[PDB]
Amino acid sequence: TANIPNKLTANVRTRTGKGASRQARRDGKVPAVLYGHGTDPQHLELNARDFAAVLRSHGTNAILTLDIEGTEQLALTKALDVHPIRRNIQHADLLVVQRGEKVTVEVTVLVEGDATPGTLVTQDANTIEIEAEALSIPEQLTVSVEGVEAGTQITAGQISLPEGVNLISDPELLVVNVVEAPSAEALEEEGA
Amino acid sequence: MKVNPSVKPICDKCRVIRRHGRVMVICSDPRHKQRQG
């Protein structure tokens, strides 16, 4: 597994603060900070359409090559501020990474498969914490529940990781709990 | 005729139309015939 960086144009911000930031978002740009082991925070604007499309295609942890005044820098999406109501990206934290660097990242665990017919699959962890190379970060880990019967408890230690990928979350975390499907009687008691 | 603020297609043969500024549902089943008002 090896991901190619996605190119985004970025320009250094002339002004900082909420006034400047609100204007940037109104003109369709998202403010971002780039910070790094090199301890050299840069203040950037990204195009909102382009950045959003990258996140749709490659998930929250996409690897980007930023073009800053003509200098290409490799960076990883560290964190996103998303407005609870508008669902727009307000701000991005970008971490500078060199190739072959270990990065701790939270990845999305998808559930695939037909559980046994009387079963309900409940997912208790949306996410797991992983160590991987900058370029080897899987965009999604899939666990299969295709066969498990009631009572089974898929834990984080039981999920397939590609080569290079290490588990930082402790193995005892429940990712999937499989339970026998509630009766109508149990629905009526739950939350009464 | 049903006359209600909410008019909904009751079966898959119900068609929503606008006629003379009213929303209406016309259908082959005369029970489902209804008018916004």
Binding site: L55, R56, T60, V82, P84, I85, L120, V121, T122, Q123, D124, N126, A181, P182, S183, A184, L187, E188, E190, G191, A192 | -
Partner: protein, 136 residues
């Protein structure tokens, strides 16, 4: 009905209906949820009504979480009383709901039935709400 077992202060100032919810704004237990778009006091009677609507629609084979508990008391004075003579006795239990707050969550295998069930619940609530998923 959901009532707290005890409260330290049985007569409280009204909860303030200001600001966007800073906590509980995402679906954390189920795959679908109801997200508030308006400020309201949601009472325990409305929560019960909404939850039973969801249960009836799915019949069985699903799980409903209620992310909101009505622990805020609202008082009422006895009927036909003049102003004054002390604060009324507690009468309603409400949750202070802010826009962005996820009120109900549902896990169900079928998306179509799940969305319909949550719509049935929304019509029971005093506010405007939308269906939200775990996905971005």
């Amino acid at each position: 009905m959901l009532i707290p077992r005890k409260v330290k202060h049985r007569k409280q100032h009204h909860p303030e209906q200001r600001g966007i919810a800073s906590g509980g704004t995402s679906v954390s237990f189920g795959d679908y949820g109801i997200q508030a778009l308006e400020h309201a006091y949601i009472t325990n009677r409305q929560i019960e009504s909404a939850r039973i609507a969801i249960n009836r629609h799915i019949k069985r084979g699903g799980k409903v979480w209620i992310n909101i508990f009505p622990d805020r008391p609202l008082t009422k004075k006895p009927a036909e009383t003049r102003m004054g003579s002390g604060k009324g006795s507690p009468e309603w239990w409400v949750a202070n709901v802010k826009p962005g707050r996820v009120l109900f969550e549902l896990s169900y295998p079928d998306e179509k039935t799940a969305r319909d069930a949550l719509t049935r619940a929304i019509h029971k609530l005093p506010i405007k709400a939308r269906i939200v998923t775990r996905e971005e």
